[PDB]
């Protein structure tokens, strides 16, 4: 094609069936992989089109794109999708018939193989029965790209450490000609640096990292210990949030996250009695009550659901005007995911964490118990340190003064976000200072 972008748009349309890219960022990433002069790191949430960023460029390349993916279930999802698009995609694994195995190995030995995209477990990629095939592919210069999917699996500080992933670096170096595309949904900066080092990515690494920052979310922290009427404070909070078309009255809905079922039940009643209708949602309820509560919340019959973290996964509601954490979350990640259910329609929403040192001490305690249980059962691990530090970053978020968006950015590894008087601290630095000084005196 006269224009490389025109061929990319063409293939995205003709093969994959999309008129545009989901985001400028997915576009930029895909284009950097096509240009092929840089190793590429892509860190985008599950559903943000990571796959395409290597799958489309794989099709516009001379040769084969090997895609290392950690477990067979994940491979199969994409193989089947790619087969619906009549893409020449193969998978080498031991969940196969020994016949299919040799049919493919033969196809890979051909000068001009049928296979365009080869999905493979890291186990398979390091196994000696595959080494000959790998070598002839390397020798013939028949690899266009090496792709390492679920790249965080290389990090002991990530959530899913796989020793198998430690070997992928040696492999990467052998494929000098083929650029490496490493992808994950979840990487703190420390996991990023492990991905960059442990996979021997060639600097300069092009990074495409979906930021946390949403311009329409107002984050604040309130100290339960500093409030005479906590339930009253929450009620005013929910009402202000829902009362953003004064003429029409209550519009939108909200979520209030609590650690325990007991708390969900009681807090729902306390709010209802104080003039904001609310219902509890938690896994203790019968399946049918959950679907009635969710439904009532979804239909805006009851505007406020008070739930455990068991609520939100399977829900698309775009006019959540507020998420309030009544108890601090297990982790900054949790808090981000939960608070972030607010404001999906882009209109102003409010995320408020109700911090108490008592909650903090209780969650800190329960994290140290469940780590101990794991340390007894499957022995000591560096991920336990990351779990504790995951809580700590949220404790820190509550107990320090600074832009709240900035603190979430620091933790996930985003740039300083354009918080436009969009958090308590940026809107009134002194007010937050006062509350922290005041919380100091409480002990």
């Amino acid at each position, epitope marked *: 094609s006269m224009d490389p972008e025109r061929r990319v748009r063409s293939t995205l349309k003709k093969v994959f069936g999309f008129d545009s890219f989901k985001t400028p960022l997915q576009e930029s990433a895909t284009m950097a992989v096509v240009k092929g002069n840089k190793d590429v790191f892509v860190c985008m949430p599950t559903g943000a089109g990571k796959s395409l960023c290597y799958q489309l460029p794989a099709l516009l390349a001379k040769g084969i794109t090997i895609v290392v993916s950690p477990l067979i279930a994940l491979i199969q999802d994409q193989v089947d999708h790619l087969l619906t698009l009549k893409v020449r995609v193969s998978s080498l694994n031991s969940k196969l018939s020994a016949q299919e195995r040799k049919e493919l190995l033969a196809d890979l030995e051909r000068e001009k193989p049928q296979t365009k995209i080869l999905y493979i477990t890291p186990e398979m990629a390091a196994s000696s029965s595959f080494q000959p095939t790998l070598n002839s592919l390397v020798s013939r210069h028949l690899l266009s790209y090496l792709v390492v999917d679920e790249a965080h699996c290389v990090s002991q500080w990530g959530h899913d450490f796989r020793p198998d992933y430690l070997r992928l670096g040696a492999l990467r170096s052998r494929l000098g000609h083929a650029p490496c595309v490493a992808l994950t949904a979840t990487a703190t900066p420390q996991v990023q640096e492990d991905v960059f080092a442990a996979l021997h990515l060639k600097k300069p690494v*092009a990074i495409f990292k979906t930021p946390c920052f949403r311009a329409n979310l107002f984050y604040d922290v309130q100290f339960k210990e500093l409030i005479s009427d906590p339930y009253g404070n929450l009620k005013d909070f929910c009402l202000k949030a829902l009362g953003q078309e004064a003429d029409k009255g209550l519009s939108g809905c909200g979520i209030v996250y609590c650690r325990t079922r007991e708390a969900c039940e009681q807090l729902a009643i306390e709010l209802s009695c104080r003039g904001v209708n609310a219902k509890a949602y938690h896994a203790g309820l019968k399946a049918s009550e959950r679907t009635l509560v969710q439904n009532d919340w979804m239909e805006e019959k009851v505007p406020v659901i008070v739930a455990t973290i068991s609520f939100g996964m399977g829900v698309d509601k775009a006019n959540v005007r507020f998420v309030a954490h009544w108890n601090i979350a297990k982790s900054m990640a949790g808090y981000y995911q939960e608070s972030g259910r607010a404001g999906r329609d882009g209109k102003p929403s409010w995320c408020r964490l109700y911090y108490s040192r008592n909650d903090r001490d209780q969650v800190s305690f329960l994290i140290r118990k469940e780590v101990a249980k794991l340390q007894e059962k499957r022995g000591n691990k560096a991920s336990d340190k990351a779990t504790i530090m995951a809580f700590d970053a949220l404790v820190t978020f509550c107990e320090e003064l600074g832009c709240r968006h900035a603190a979430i950015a620091k933790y996930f590894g985003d740039a300083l976000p354009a918080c436009a008087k969009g958090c308590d601290h940026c809107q009134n630095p002194t007010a937050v200072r006062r509350r922290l000084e005041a919380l100091e005196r409480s002990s």
Partner: nanobody, 124 residues
Framework: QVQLVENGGGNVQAGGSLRLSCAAS????????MTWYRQAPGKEREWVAA???????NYAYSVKGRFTISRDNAKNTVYLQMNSLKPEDTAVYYC???????????????????WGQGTQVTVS
């Protein structure tokens, strides 16, 4: 990309001190390691001192006890205090900002190594 500018070079009597600075500018989230190298003309480049983000420091055996590397992350700037200067310390001193993570609010960034032009240290 990143500008690494060195400062604080000079001509100084043996036994005297210098303080070199080294400031990275750009959309810097983090620097894995900042290392001071020195290069006398027609000699092999030499490792002087390093500091990780984390504040772990390491010195060449030749300068241990005489030089201190320090940093101000607020300014992505590392300092090399050089005391008891010897003529053997005469060289061009330069920085490596190794594992430099840059990032725009758009989510587009880089991981790369960056290098200073250097600063002249002569010890009579």
């Amino acid at each position: 990309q990143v500008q690494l500018v060195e400062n604080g070079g000079g001509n100084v009597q043996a036994g005297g001190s210098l303080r070199l600075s080294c400031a990275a500018s750009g959309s810097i989230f983090s620097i894995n390691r900042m290392t001071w190298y020195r290069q006398a003309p027609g000699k092999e480049r030499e490792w002087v001192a390093a500091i990780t983000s984390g504040g772990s420091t390491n010195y060449a055996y030749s300068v241990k006890g005489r030089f201190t590397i320090s940093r101000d992350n607020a300014k992505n700037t590392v300092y090399l205090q050089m005391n008891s200067l010897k003529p053997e310390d005469t060289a061009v001193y330069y920085c490596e900002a190794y594992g430099t993570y840059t990032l725009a609010p758009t989510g587009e960034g880089e991981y790369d190594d960056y290098w200073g032009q250097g600063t002249q240290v002569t010890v009579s």
